[PDB]
Amino acid sequence: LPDSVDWREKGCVTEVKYQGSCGACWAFSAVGALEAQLKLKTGKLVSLSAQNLVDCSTEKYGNKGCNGGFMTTAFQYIIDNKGIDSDASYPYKAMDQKCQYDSKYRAATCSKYTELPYGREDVLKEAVANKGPVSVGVDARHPSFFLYRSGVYYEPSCTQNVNHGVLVVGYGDLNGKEYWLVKNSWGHNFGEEGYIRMARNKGNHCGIASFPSYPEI
């Protein structure tokens, strides 16, 4: 496997988004993963609608819109629905709204998704290298997480009780510290222009490899 990977270098990662006061991280994580596959498949990089998931992948999928959701069930909604609209056609409002999906604005489809084995950082490395960015959940409730600015994030108080959906878009090594390159959805002001390098091969730190999954087209 490559020693390092950065899907941004392959033009497979869209701009960092700002979720605001709506707990839609799960939807942003999910569209981010599909965005990479859509690019790999069609050659075009297109932001997908996080709002479409918030408003439509709801109760039937165990999701609660601005109050939380799952990347896997969001993927299943896209499969069941036979599509997801583009972000431009169905903009993000950081609010729960009525479902307004319209196939005329469809920008991507999904045929299946895969959930990786719990806590295997080696399997996650292989997936990130051979398949593309992977949706994951991390424990981002510690004060240090909100204040992260640079370097590789390692928090002794971190746990494997995850609560925030993000996207691994690569991995590597910085000054002797292995890390996972994570795309967050708290805008460009957060961390490194919206990204955070989180400790890799450090005992499933913050549960980064606890619940990984990726869609395919």
Ligand X SMILES: N#C[C@]1(NC(=O)[C@H](CC2CCCCC2)NC(=O)N2CCOCC2)CCN(Cc2ccccc2)C1
Catalytic residues, by residue number, are 25, 164, 184
Q: Report the candidate in 104, 97, 108, 94 with the shortest Cα–Cα distance to residue 55.
A: 97
Contact between 70 and ligand X by CB under 6 A: the answer reads yes
Beta strands, E only, 61-208: 84-85, 106-108, 112-115, 134-138, 164-174, 177-183, 195-199
Dist CA 135 CA 138 (whole Å) = 10
Beta strands, E only, the chain: 5-6, 84-85, 106-108, 112-115, 134-138, 164-174, 177-183, 195-199, 213-216
Output 18 or 105, the one with its CB closest to ligand X.
18
> Which residue has 């590597």 as its token pair?
172
Q: Compute how many residues bind ligand X; rule: CB under 6 A.
A: 20
Dist CA 179 CA 174 (whole Å) = 7
Which positions from 165 to 184 touch ligand X by CB under 6 A, shown as an x/- string? x-------------------
Return the range that interacts with ligand X (CB under 6 A); candidates 24-32, 47-55, 88-96, 147-155. 24-32
Contact between 89 and ligand X by CB under 6 A: the answer reads no
Contact between 69 and ligand X by CB under 6 A: the answer reads yes
Output 7 or 190, the one with its CB closest to ligand X.
190
The CB-of-96 to ligand X minimum distance in angstroms stands at: 12
Return the range that interacts with ligand X (CB under 6 A); candidates 37-45, 63-71, 112-120, 193-201. 63-71
Return the range that interacts with ligand X (CB under 6 A); candidates 52-60, 101-109, 134-142, 187-195. 134-142
Among 8, 10, 141, 188, binds ligand X (CB under 6 A): 141
Contact between 93 and ligand X by CB under 6 A: the answer reads no
Dist CA 111 CA 92 (whole Å) = 24
Dist CA 75 CA 70 (whole Å) = 9
Q: Report the candidate in 200, 172, 169 with the shortest Cα–Cα distance to residue 183.
A: 169
- The residues binding ligand X (CB under 6 A) are 19, 23-26, 63-64, 67-71, 137, 140-141, 162-165, 211
